[PDB]
């Protein structure tokens, strides 16, 4: 009956971390594309 | 009592770890690829 406020924080903390990983994924996607372009220029 | 939310929470924590590990393997490849482009310059 206690610790239901705590579970709240956990679950929104997981939304926090997923949203951070999702943002990180977009930036990583961009660096991969950027490297591909740089590799194509040499070849 | 609320076991079922704890079970979904540990599952999510596993889903998030796995995704970070996949991102880690991909990040490592870009670091490696950047290093070869650097060495080409030097």
């Amino acid at each position: 009956v206690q610790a239901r406020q705590l579970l709240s924080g956990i679950v929104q903390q997981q939304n926090n971390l997923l949203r951070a990983i999702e943002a990180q994924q977009h930036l990583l996607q961009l660096t991969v594309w950027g490297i591909k372009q740089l590799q194509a220029r040499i070849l | 009592q609320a076991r079922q939310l704890l079970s979904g929470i540990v599952q999510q924590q596993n889903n998030l770890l796995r995704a970070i590990e996949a991102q880690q393997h991909l990040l490592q490849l870009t670091v490696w690829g950047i290093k070869q482009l650097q060495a080409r310059i030097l």
């Binding site: 709240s8 679950v11 997981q14 939304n15 994924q25 | 939310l5 889903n15 998030l16 991909l26 490849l29």
Partner: peptide
């Protein structure tokens, strides 16, 4: 790698919804 990561991200997004909809259940 990039297809596997979105696969896991989607799975984590469909589980966030479970856990949150499971939380409004607890809040009664």
């Amino acid at each position: 790698y990039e297809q596997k990561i979105e696969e896991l991200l989607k799975k984590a997004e469909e589980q966030q919804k479970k856990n949150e909809e499971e939380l409004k259940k607890l809040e009664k």
